[PDB]
Amino acid sequence: HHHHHGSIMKVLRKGDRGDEVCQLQTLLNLCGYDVGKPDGIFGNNTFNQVVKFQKDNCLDSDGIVGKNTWAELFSKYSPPIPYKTIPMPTANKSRAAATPVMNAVENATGVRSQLLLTFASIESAFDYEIKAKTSSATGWFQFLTGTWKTMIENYGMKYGVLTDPTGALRKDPRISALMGAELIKENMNILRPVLKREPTDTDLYLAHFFGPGAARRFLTTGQNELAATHFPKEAQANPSIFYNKDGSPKTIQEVYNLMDGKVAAHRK
Numbered sequence: 001h002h003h004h005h006g007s008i009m010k011v012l013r014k015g016d017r018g019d020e021v022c023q024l025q026t027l028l029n030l031c032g033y034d035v036g037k038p039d040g041i042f043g044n045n046t047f048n049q050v051v052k053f054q055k056d057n058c059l060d061s062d063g064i065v066g067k068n069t070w071a072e073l074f075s076k077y078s079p080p081i082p083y084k085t086i087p088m089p090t091a092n093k094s095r096a097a098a099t100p101v102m103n104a105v106e107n108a109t110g111v112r113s114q115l116l117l118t119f120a121s122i123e124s125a126f127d128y129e130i131k132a133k134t135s136s137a138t139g140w141f142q143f144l145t146g147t148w149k150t151m152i153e154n155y156g157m158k159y160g161v162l163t164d165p166t167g168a169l170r171k172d173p174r175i176s177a178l179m180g181a182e183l184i185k186e187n188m189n190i191l192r193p194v195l196k197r198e199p200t201d202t203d204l205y206l207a208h209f210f211g212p213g214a215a216r217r218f219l220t221t222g223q224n225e226l227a228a229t230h231f232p233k234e235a236q237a238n239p240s241i242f243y244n245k246d247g248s249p250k251t252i253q254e255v256y257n258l259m260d261g262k263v264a265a266h267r268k
């Protein structure tokens, strides 16, 4: 039930801090119990609201959030942007069919449709049902199974999606775009501070493909430097882009231009 999901949630209590407290705080708000802006610190305000929430619902009201309380939150919260508001595309594997979808996600998330259209194009040639034969990667945004979960747990409620054990929602174009936009926003906030410029589609794609931490180090690591030297992991994992045909290591500049090149093929 919602009980099994609440069952795997972290058992919280006053004093705790992190993503869980933040999710707790948000659900509280979305349930009518305001605890102010979600800051990730389980303090007094959150504690009181929890107790009161537990009392209003006949739950062991000691202030501790366990299976039953999580279950009650997933049941009473009201999504501020239910995903059904985002239309399904009238066809899979179709750029023209995904546009209206991306336009809706732009209005809902802020992220520009063109950027969304590019990503979907470079990741699944618009097949929102595709599953990479090489890894977890699935759907329009080729979400891995891991990051998808973390994405669904911190933003799902925002669009009315609590759990997705199978991670099967990645096959849903709507929720894929929504989560895609949220990931892009996360990443465009990590980058602008370091890149004295608005992160570009390629900057952003680099974070999407290699992760933000690495993209960060990379977008700031000396043009003529030997990438493989600074990104052994990625180089080993994607030698085709980090190594020349003869096996010599490419420079940072070359790798960048190759990537920008791959992105350049799915733009407007």
Ligand SMILES: CC(=O)N[C@@H]1[C@@H](O)[C@H](O[C@@H]2O[C@H](CO)[C@@H](O[C@@H]3O[C@H](CO)[C@@H](O[C@@H]4O[C@H](CO)[C@@H](O)[C@H](O)[C@H]4NC(C)=O)[C@H](O)[C@H]3NC(C)=O)[C@H](O)[C@H]2NC(C)=O)[C@@H](CO)O[C@H]1O
Pocket: 132, 134, 135, 137, 141, 142, 143, 144, 145, 147, 148, 150, 151, 183, 186, 187, 207, 208, 209, 210, 211, 212, 213, 214, 237, 238
């Ligand atoms: C070998 C190969 O080519 N495989 C491809 C996959 O790698 C690729 O999937 C993407 O893979 C990267 C790295 O494996 C992965 O990166 C993770 O990204 C998340 C979020 O961007 C990072 O977590 C964030 O970290 C910051 C701090 O740096 C936090 O502030 C933020 O809150 C965190 N948010 C989340 C979501 O947790 C991870 O640190 C980072 N991990 C690593 C090791 O770098 C991407 O998430 C994967 N992208 C997707 C869409 O799944 C896949 C798709 O492009 O294609 C494969 O072929």
Ligand code: NI
Pocket: 060, 064, 065, 066, 067, 068, 069
């Ligand atoms: Ni409980």
